[PDB]
Amino acid sequence: GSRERLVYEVRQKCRNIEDICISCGSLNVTLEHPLFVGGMCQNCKNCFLECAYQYDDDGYQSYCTICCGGRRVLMCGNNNCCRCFCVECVDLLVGPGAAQAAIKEDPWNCYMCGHKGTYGLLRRREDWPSRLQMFFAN
């Protein structure tokens, strides 16, 4: 019933990732996450609407790109990207230990910037700019 157990089931192909909210683990998916393959529930849609483009004075987004929270986050080293990712989301959706590899990497291109585009279960949508246009549409 936890987010961690649901993601475990996804890795075991006992469940499709589009059928879970990848930001909180809710089964009450109401849309596809606009940036990565996977679902999004109404709570997280709302958190994204309020939170996703909040910025700190360091020029970076205030919260995690995936969950729109986090207490401690990694910042993208791309001088053209202002995104952050929390350790919890990274080690869950990419895989355990992934966050510490990324923290060590210098400089680090985040999962939205990286050319590989797929990282464990974390798969960037090829059409994320279209999905963002639709998400913020009237």
């Binding site: 360091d58 986090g70 923290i103």
Partner: peptide, 7 residues
């Protein structure tokens, strides 16, 4: 990666 606290 640089890190930061969100709080």
């Amino acid at each position: 990666a640089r890190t930061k606290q969100t709080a």
